[PDB]
Design a protein around this ligand. Structure first.
Ligand code: CLA
Ligand code: CLA
Ligand code: CLA
Ligand code: CLA
Ligand code: CLA
Ligand code: CLA
Ligand code: CLA
Ligand SMILES: CCCCCCCCCCCCCCCC(=O)OC[C@H](COP(=O)(O)OC[C@@H](O)CO)OC(=O)CCCCCCCCCCCCCCC
Ligand SMILES: CC1=C(/C=C/C(C)=C/C=C/C(C)=C\C=C\C=C(C)\C=C\C=C(C)\C=C\C2=C[C@@H](C)[C@H](O)CC2(C)C)C(C)(C)C[C@@H](O)C1
Ligand SMILES: CC1=C(/C=C/C(C)=C\C=C\C(C)=C/C=C/C=C(C)/C=C/C=C(C)/C=C/C2=C(C)C(=O)CCC2(C)C)C(C)(C)CCC1
Ligand SMILES: CC1=C(C/C=C(\C)CCC[C@H](C)CCC[C@H](C)CCCC(C)C)C(=O)c2ccccc2C1=O
Ligand code: SF4
Ligand code: SF4
Ligand SMILES: [Cl-]
Lengths: 751, 69, 73, 141, 80, 143, 73, 40
């Protein structure tokens, strides 16, 4: 019994249990309380690791689906509160430790900074001179550009935003506590997938973009209209003045003189001065027209709100997703989607696999769309922000996708019920897993031979003094003619298949060379032989990662080698040295290998992005009109060999990282070496096995017993699974930190 | 010759507790090869990979236990 | 015998190259050390060894090679 | 071993079943009786339906048969413990395999002869140097 | 085929046989332990060497030992 | 006599003087570089102008290693001794693993505060037979 | 880290006095230890050995690889 | 309650508290007496 509010249901499907778990601190001092195999306490050091390994494995703690659902819901509230703390921290550092107003007054002669370092042990050198007398660390997160597009002009608004973010974090934390301990919703409530979808479509995504269209129209658009006109930020009215004095809007947008009447009478064209379809970019800032983005958010809101009405809830109108799914079956696929509604309404891991896959794919789509259609003012000219945002979203997407593989496998081991999947899509997938995987295997072999092998052919031909026998734009050509054709279609579209659009959706497809200040923001990104070869590298590495994770899911129950793999679990090291050796058959080990292959794929993607943008897009433009690129168009002739990537990309561009000592970039050289060290360190865990280390520990325990200093909690070597987890965690950390230091030194040292 | 509560040191060589000390829990009847049951404060390695602890009891013969107490 | 004349400016030769994969650039690049055909420069220190030993002609090296043929037999 | 009887489980097929080894080398059979027509998991992937009454199923290995047997006796509300596993050769010879003496091997049964028993401890194996240049290993002597 | 030996420290807990996924082992009458039973390995031709039995053994160092030997179609666990 | 001829005093070394006129400020004190120059002008520099530490044991360079060595050793022996003492004290408490995982703050602080006498404590445990154990009483593996 | 932050003078540069003293024991007079062979007044140098002049001339010349000079690296 | 004190005395909290205290010690010492390569 804690706080007891009235009730708060209004003929709703809301159903809760009051006070199921009392608030108490005792279990805080009882570590491992949630696991029966842990509650008694430790006896060996393994006990510690598993305590962290199983902390969020809510299935393994309780068999009750309702309690698992409640734990998940409150954990989501806690995670949202963490994200709120982080975002308010960003806004606070923008308010109190940034040069934001100074940057806003003159964004072409000052570098954004929002982290000041204290002077100690010499590290004060990291406070590089970023312009206007400001000294700090140059940020590449694009926070300043977002804040300018939103219409921030003052430190006090950022400070108020940070305070609101802290209050929101407190609210989320209290909601998590409240819905686990005070009013915990029943399993019947979570399974209302139709209502949840209606609300997340019309309410979360639809009303979200509607309110943001409101802010963009009333705050972002007039304020940026005045900012780009050269008006000093202090002379611009505050956001609320345009709402108190509507004549300001009306003189910035004459349609406002007519008000809301054109909206309700379907006379929308009157609004054509602030709801636009310009395309292209803003000539002053290099970003997307904010009016275009406001019209975009308005249309997206209408779309999502309409979508939020498909599913039936309390009123007979709408769809049952179970019915729809059951109706989709064909002569090739047995019972079709029968059973999918029951799977996705009783299995958290199935939902999480779907959602991880789609959210990772979306994060990648975000990187790809934001680089070529730069949405924020002055982001495209800031090549460091451009590179950093692209690569960051890439990595997040890749990790989410690999997690999707993990949770497909966990579904197969823990929630798949064969009596509920008789001759449906999942069952037939299991029943021809061999065809699927043997073919994916062969496609990967073909894609590797005919992508990487082309590079090896070129390296060997060039070394043999035989340039005319290479795959290149000047020899044996591999032109990507379909991508060229679609680029041409996009360039012709404003005048034919997109009449009411003035410019292209993106200048990468072709057209003018948009440059702000002396640097190009965007220009046609042409595609040739090297681009063909690297796109097939991408297809190859993606296919191999998919091969690994899909094999992990489809064989998690069994294989010809191990027909009872399901009984062994999702996470386990092997089934012994027998059958020739069965190490790494688990779904967890497939995730473990897919991590490395995803890292490979994304490393190549981001290297391709960096080199192609530095060679053929980015650069400085003379007042005569001509363009001079950062790496002088070297991609076409150098990216067609492995030696070209080793010398003209890695070797040439690493000069900034390795010479960073003695300047504000010194920390990037430090972390370059740091990533290298962590990568090398991971090889100890990956190339060895725990038996050797357990024996070494035996000798060291003898040393301790000799002086009567051996611990009661006996030291054990890491488990096989944990050895692999540590190895891969360190491999990814070291390699990614290496590339991060490299990229930041490079993109910050190239104008 | 052993009794419940006797502290003994293990002498089996191949045993995990050779040189370590355990306590006698029970003594089984004659005709059995390893009648003396000993318990230990330190578990052995017994268990599948990743198991929290191990086995802390084992049977021995009198010639394999050395009375300490 | 050439490298004996000026062992500080001539590059000692290991053996000849014969590779049908070569193009003009590599043929020209490996026709080095004063040779007329493609060639590899020896880094085994074997010229200095045979010269300090007292050998000064291709005849003596050839005789040693044939003798080692007989020794191996 | 006379002639195997029993209906095949109701199943639409899969790519995970028998290969060339089954006809060239050897295959395996498992029979069992079920009180009801009911769903079970194929060790080769997917779901199948066992018939009410006798059931006869062919698999590629002995291990797949024993995995199906554990599933039968540990995953159905009334257990299925009457399953029999046979080895089948291309000549047609059928070799009854499991349970070997009509009694599951986990429980003692009179009449079994100890195999692979040693009258010593593991630590009492002889030193390898004492048996080198012989064909044996310390556990074989 | 692999070799499977059972030494006299066996307590006859039957977990040997319960763990075997290929029915290599049996419980046979004996007199060395209280349970009056010991593990036996009459069918090592079907052994694959997964080592589940030893993983199940409780005695201080195993009473059952699997030594991998001459690899066959059966011991390599081949379905083809 | 002419020992360490390969090196010269930093006050003599002209490269050190040129670089020390440019010693950066490591903290907020606008004199940190100047204090650093004055302080390091006492060591032995090399041709490049950086100080070189002599650790062969001569007391003229005792501050280059001997004094920090003594200090570290006192502190490290302190840490190890109080940790071992707490570890011993837990063993008589029925469930020692829990107090290894959930620290007995009062007991651990009592042990930490008494560590300044760890050399004499270790000498006493050595003489009394508490520090070291016998071989025949320590578990070992087969040979 | 100390060089990265612009203070290369704050490195820990330990002079290898042991091997330098050893080189000095064989005539190497660079470090100025004057021990054994590096000391002309020493009985190891006042032996009349037919190799001491050549060995000293080869070891006290910084033109070969004979007991190369060493520092903190 | 006793639970909160026990949680505050767990190994991770205690080790991070000790590490933070030692970090503060070393940081402030090098703030008021920086650049001590050796003992004068
Ligand atoms: C002071 C308030 C309070 C109290 C005393 C309790 C009491 C209890 N809770 Mg509850 N809970 C609270 C707040 C509180 N909760 C909040 C705010 C949430 C929303 C996240 C939840 C959601 C919740 C769930 C889902 C569960 C519990 C459980 C439990 C029980 C076990 C707790 C444990 O394992 O040790 C204590 C553990 C910790 C303190 C974790 C350490 C902190 C983590 C590692 C990081 C911090 C994340 C944090 C939640 C958010 C960040 C804060 C932000 C400012 C950055 C216990 C009786 C569990 C249970 O019922 O056991 C069966 C259970 O599953 N709670
Ligand atoms: C959300 C992420 C985030 C990040 C990564 C940073 C990062 C940083 N901030 Mg910022 N900040 C944030 C959010 C964030 N902040 C928020 C939300 C606010 C509003 C409250 C602020 C307000 C703020 C101010 C006012 C300042 C900074 C400053 C700094 C810098 C100095 C950090 C420091 O020295 O800490 C100091 C270290 C301590 C206070 C000691 C930490 C004690 C630890 C937790 C001990 C752990 C053990 C102990 C038992 C605790 C365990 C909990 C227990 C219950 C178990 C640093 C780079 C400073 C700066 O910019 O420098 C110019 C500065 O003045 N921040
Ligand atoms: C329009 C109604 C609505 C909205 C806005 C949401 C929104 C959300 N839901 Mg919810 N849900 C709803 C109805 C709604 N739901 C219903 C009817 C059900 C029952 C079927 C559920 C059951 C459900 C479950 C089981 C879960 C969610 C979760 C989530 C969150 C995950 C997505 C996210 O993080 O996005 C972005 C995040 C934000 C934008 C942060 C803002 C969050 C605040 C609290 C929302 C405030 C909006 C509110 C209407 C006030 C607006 C008025 C005015 C200020 C304009 C999200 C904030 C998941 C979650 O995270 O749990 C906490 C979760 O597991 N929903
Ligand atoms: C959630 C986002 C959001 C928010 C909260 C606001 C908020 C506001 N807007 Mg804005 N706006 C938005 C989105 C948003 N807008 C979008 C998407 C557009 C693009 C279409 C616009 C374009 C816009 C314009 C052009 C104007 C505003 C104006 C205003 C202000 C006064 C309007 C009002 O609320 O009075 C209350 C509204 C009413 C009482 C409506 C009643 C009038 C009609 C006749 C009723 C018809 C309703 C009926 C059910 C439909 C049937 C009609 C049919 C039978 C004929 C107000 C603070 C006005 C302003 O003040 O300018 C600064 C103004 O001129 N907005
Ligand atoms: C919304 C996304 C999401 C959700 C909520 C889950 C949920 C869950 N996952 Mg999953 N997964 C995800 C994404 C997600 N995952 C991703 C992105 C991946 C790819 C890496 C995976 C791969 C994966 C595997 C392989 C496994 C899980 C497992 C689990 C379960 C246990 C959680 C746990 O390990 O506890 C505690 C968490 C930890 C101990 C993490 C500590 C180690 C991290 C990696 C260090 C990170 C370092 C840091 C980021 C940077 C360096 C800082 C350092 C220098 C200080 C849990 C139910 C486990 C399971 O058994 O499922 C039932 C398990 O086997 N997941
Ligand atoms: C550069 C190192 C390297 C290389 C060459 C490979 C090679 C390969 N890996 Mg592998 N991998 C690596 C590192 C590497 N891996 C690491 C570190 C890990 C740990 C995570 C993995 C883990 C891993 C997994 C889990 C998988 C692979 C897969 C594959 C195969 C993909 C199919 C393919 O590319 O077909 C074509 C082969 C090539 C492109 C290799 C180069 C061939 C050259 C260019 C031509 C050969 C010339 C000629 C034959 C020379 C003959 C000389 C003559 C004297 C005989 C492929 C053969 C996947 C697979 O098997 O897919 C089916 C698979 O699932 N890898
Ligand atoms: C692991 C080997 C190692 C060693 C040998 C050193 C050694 C040193 N480092 Mg370095 N460092 C290392 C690793 C190492 N570092 C690494 C890995 C990094 C990268 C993170 C750094 C980065 C680094 C930087 C950036 C700096 C140093 C600095 C220093 C010097 C400062 C000494 C000092 O603070 O004065 C002496 C300090 C004390 C006496 C305080 C210690 C706290 C005591 C215990 C207080 C308690 C008193 C107690 C009662 C004892 C009193 C006596 C008692 C008996 C009565 C010192 C010579 C600083 C320097 O000035 O360089 C010359 C400097 O700025 N280090
Ligand atoms: C760059 C792209 C241009 C190059 C063309 C390449 C042609 C690729 C082959 C065509 C696609 C075949 C799938 C649709 C054909 C199709 O779905 O037919 C329909 C049929 C099922 O139809 P049903 O009548 O059963 O529909 C009932 C549904 O409700 C589901 O229950 O699907 C199958 O039979 C499953 C077999 C899929 C196995 C084929 C997949 C092979 C993988 C390779 C595909 C590469 C595509 C790459 C493009 C991104
Ligand atoms: C007391 C203590 C313990 C244990 C202590 C024990 C048991 C210690 C045992 C030590 C043993 C058995 C041997 C130690 C031998 C040490 C040697 C041989 C030191 C040699 C050092 C030399 C030759 C140093 C020389 C240089 C002298 C300074 C002579 C110069 O400028 C530099 C330089 C390097 C030349 C614990 C572990 C139980 C608890 C701890 O807190 C402390
Ligand atoms: C009757 C006799 C005596 C007279 C002896 C006479 C008259 C001649 C004796 C010759 C002898 C005793 C040895 C000659 C040995 C030559 C040898 C063994 C050559 C060995 C070469 C080897 C092994 C390989 C060399 C290599 C080759 C070939 C190369 O070309 C490159 C270098 C290297 C790779 C090293 C006297 C009265 C004195 C004493 C009494 C007995
Ligand atoms: C080195 C190694 C070990 C030995 C590694 C061990 C025993 C881990 C040692 C970890 C120490 C005890 C903790 C140090 C790291 C901490 C987690 C970091 C905490 C830092 C805070 C105090 C700030 C294995 O056990 C192993 C097992 C399987 C394959 C490879 C290997 C392997 O390579
Ligand atoms: S090597 Fe390790 S993972 Fe592989 S089979 Fe043996 S024990 Fe298992
Ligand atoms: S092999 Fe070991 S664990 Fe298995 S029954 Fe025999 S004694 Fe028990
Ligand atoms: Cl090249």
């Amino acid at each position: 019994m804690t706080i007891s509010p009235p009730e708060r249901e209004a003929k709703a499907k809301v159903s809760v249990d009051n006070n199921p778990v009392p608030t108490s601190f005792e279990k805080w001092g009882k570590p491992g309380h949630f696991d029966r195999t842990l509650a008694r306490g430790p006896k060996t050091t393994t006990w510690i690791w598993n305590l962290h390994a199983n902390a969020h494995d809510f299935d393994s703690q309780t068999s009750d689906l309702e309690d698992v659902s409640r734990k998940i819901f409150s954990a989501h509230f806690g995670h949202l509160a963490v994200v709120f703390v982080w975002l308010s921290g960003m806004y606070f550092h923008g308010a109190k430790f940034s040069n934001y107003e100074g940057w806003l007054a003159d964004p072409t002669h000052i570098k954004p900074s929002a982290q000041v370092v204290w002077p100690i042990v010499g590290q004060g050198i990291l406070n590089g001179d970023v312009g206007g007398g400001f000294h700090g660390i140059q940020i590449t997160s694009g926070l300043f550009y977002l804040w300018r597009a939103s219409g921030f002009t003052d430190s006090y608004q950022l400070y108020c935003t940070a305070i609101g973010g802290l209050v929101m974090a407190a609210l989320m934390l209290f909601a998590g506590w409240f819905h686990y301990h005070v009013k915990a919703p029943k399993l019947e409530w979570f399974q209302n997938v139709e209502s949840m979808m209606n609300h997340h479509l019309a309410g979360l995504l639809g009303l979200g973009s509607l309110g943001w269209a409101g802010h963009q129209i009333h705050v972002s658009m007039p304020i940026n209209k005045l900012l780009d006109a050269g008006v000093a930020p202090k002379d611009i009215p505050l956001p609320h003045e345009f709402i108190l004095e509507p004549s300001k809007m009306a003189e910035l947008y004459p349609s406002f003189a007519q008000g809301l009447t054109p909206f309700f009478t379907l006379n929308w064209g009157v609004y054509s001065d602030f709801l636009t379809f310009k395309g292209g970019l803003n000539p002053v800032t290099g970003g997307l027209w904010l009016s275009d983005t406001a019209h975009h958010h308005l249309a997206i809101a209408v779309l999502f709100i309409i979508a939020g009405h498909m599913y039936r809830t309390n009123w007979g109108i709408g769809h049952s997703m179970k019915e729809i799914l059951e109706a989709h079956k064909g002569p090739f696929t047995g019972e079709g989607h029968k059973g999918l509604y029951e799977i996705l309404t009783t299995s958290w891991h199935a939902q999480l696999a779907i959602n991880l896959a789609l959210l990772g794919s979306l994060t990648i789509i975000v990187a790809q769309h934001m680089y070529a259609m730069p949405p924020y003012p002055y982001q495209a000219i800031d090549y460091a922000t451009q590179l950093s945002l692209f690569t960051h979203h890439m990595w997040i997407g890749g990790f989410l996708i690999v997690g999707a593989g993990a949770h497909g496998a966990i579904f197969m081991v823990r929630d798949y019920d064969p009596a509920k999947n008789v001759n449906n899509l999942l069952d037939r997938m299991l029943r021809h897993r061999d065809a699927i995987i043997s073919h994916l295997n062969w496609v990967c072999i073909f894609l590797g031979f005919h992508s990487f092998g082309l590079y090896i052919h070129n390296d060997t031909m060039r070394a043999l003094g035989r340039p005319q026998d290479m795959f290149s734009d000047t020899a044996i050509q591999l032109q990507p003619i379909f991508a060229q054709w679609v680029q041409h279609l996009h360039t012709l579209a404003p005048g034919a298949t997109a009449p009411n659009a003035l410019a292209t959706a993106s200048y990468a497809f072709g057209g003018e060379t948009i440059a702000v200040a002396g640097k190009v923001a965007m220009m046609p990104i042409t595609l040739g032989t090297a681009d063909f070869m690297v796109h097939h590298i991408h297809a190859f590495t993606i296919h191999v990662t998919a091969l690994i994770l899909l094999k992990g899911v489809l064989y998690a129950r069994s294989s010809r080698l191990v027909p009872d793999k399901a009984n062994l679990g999702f996470r386990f090291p092997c089934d012994g040295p027998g059958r020739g050796g069965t190490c790494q058959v688990s779904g967890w080990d497939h995730v473990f290998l897919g991590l490395f292959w995803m890292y490979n794929s994304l490393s190549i993607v981001i290297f391709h992005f960096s080199w192609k943008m530095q060679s053929d897009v980015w650069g400085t433009v003379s007042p005569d009109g001509s363009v001079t690129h950062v790496t002088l168009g070297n991609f076409a002739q150098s990216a067609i060999t492995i030696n070209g990537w080793l010398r003209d990309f890695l070797w040439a561009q690493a000069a900034n990282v390795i010479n960073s000592y003695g300047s504000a970039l010194s920390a990037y050289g430090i972390m370059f070496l740091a990533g290298h060290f962590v990568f090398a360190f991971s090889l100890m865990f990956l190339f060895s096995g725990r038996g050797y280390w357990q024996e070494l520990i035996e000798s060291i325990v003898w040393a301790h017993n000799k002086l009567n200093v051996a611990p009661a909690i006996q030291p054990r070597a890491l488990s096989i699974i944990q050895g692999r987890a540590v190895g891969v965690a360190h491999y990814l950390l070291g390699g990614i930190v290496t590339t991060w230091a490299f990229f930041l030194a490079r993109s910050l040292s190239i104008g | 010759a052993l009794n419940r509560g006797d502290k003994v040191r293990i002498k089996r060589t191949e045993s995990y507790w050779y040189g370590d000390v355990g306590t006698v829990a029970s003594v089984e009847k004659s005709g059995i090869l390893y009648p003396v049951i000993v318990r230990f404060d330190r578990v052995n390695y017994n268990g599948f990979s990743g198991s929290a602890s191990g086995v802390n009891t084992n049977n021995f013969a009198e010639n394999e236990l050395e009375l300490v107490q | 015998e050439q490298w004996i004349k000026d062992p500080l400016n001539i590059r000692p030769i290991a053996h000849a190259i014969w590779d049908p994969h070569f193009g003009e650039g590599a043929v020209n690049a490996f026709t080095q050390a004063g040779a007329s055909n493609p060639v590899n420069i020896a880094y085994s220190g074997v010229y200095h060894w045979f010269y300090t030993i007292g050998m000064t002609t291709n005849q003596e090296l050839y005789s040693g090679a044939v003798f080692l043929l007989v020794l191996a037999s | 071993m006379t002639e195997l009887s029993g209906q095949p489980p109701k199943f639409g097929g899969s790519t995970g079943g028998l290969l060339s080894k089954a006809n060239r080398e050897e295959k395996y059979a498992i029979t069992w009786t079920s009180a009801s027509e009911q769903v079970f998991e194929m060790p080769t992937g997917g779901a199948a339906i066992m018939n009410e009454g006798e059931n006869l199923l062919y698999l590629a290995r002995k291990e797949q048969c024993l995995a199906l047997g554990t599933q039968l006796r540990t995953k159905f509300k009334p257990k299925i413990q009457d399953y029999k596993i046979y080895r089948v050769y291309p000549s047609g010879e059928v070799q009854y395999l499991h349970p070997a003496d009509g009694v599951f091997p986990e429980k003692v049964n009179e009449g079994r002869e100890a195999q692979g028993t040693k009258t010593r401890r593991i630590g009492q194996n002889p030193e390898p140097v004492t048996i080198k240049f012989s064909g044996k290993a310390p556990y074989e002597v | 085929s692999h070799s499977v030996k059972i030494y006299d420290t066996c307590i006859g807990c039957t977990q040997c046989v319960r763990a075997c996924p290929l029915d290599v082992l049996e419980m046979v009458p004996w007199d060395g332990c209280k349970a009056a039973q010991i593990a036996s390995s009459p069918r090592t031709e079907d052994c694959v060497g997964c080592k589940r039995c030893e993983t199940a053994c409780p005695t201080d160092f195993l009473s059952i030992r699997v030594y991998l030997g001459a690899e066959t179609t059966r011991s390599m666990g081949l379905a083809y | 006599a002419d020992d360490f001829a390969n090196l010269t005093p930093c006050s003599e070394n002209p490269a050190y003087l040129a670089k020390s006129k440019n010693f950066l400020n490591t903290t907020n004190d606008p004199n940190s570089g100047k204090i650093r120059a004055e302080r390091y002008a006492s060591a032995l520099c090399g041709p490049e102008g950086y100080p070189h530490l002599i650790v062969d044991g001569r007391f003229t360079h005792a501050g280059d290693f001997l004094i920090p060595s003594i200090l570290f050793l006192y502190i490290a022996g302190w840490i190890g001794w109080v940790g071992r003492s707490y570890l011993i004290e837990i063993r008589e408490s029925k469930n020692p693993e829990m107090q290894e995982v959930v620290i007995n703050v009062p007991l651990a602080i009592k042990k930490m505060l008494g560590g300044f006498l760890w050399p004499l404590a270790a000498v006493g445990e050595y003489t009394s037979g508490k520090l070291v154990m016998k071989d025949s009483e320590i578990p070992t593996s087969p040979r | 880290v100390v060089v990265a932050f612009g203070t290369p003078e704050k490195q820990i540069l330990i002079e290898p006095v042991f091997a330098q003293w050893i080189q000095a024991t064989s005539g190497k007079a660079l470090y100025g230890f004057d021990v054994l062979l590096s000391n002309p007044d020493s009985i190891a140098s006042t032996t009349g050995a037919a190799w001491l002049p050549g060995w000293l001339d080869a070891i006290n010349s910084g033109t070969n690889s004979l007991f190369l000079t060493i520092g903190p690296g | 309650m006793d639970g909160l004190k026990s949680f505050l005395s767990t190994a991770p909290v205690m080790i991070m508290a000790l590490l933070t205290f030692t970090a503060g010690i070393l940081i402030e010492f090098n703030r008021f007496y920086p650049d001590l390569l050796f003992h004068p």
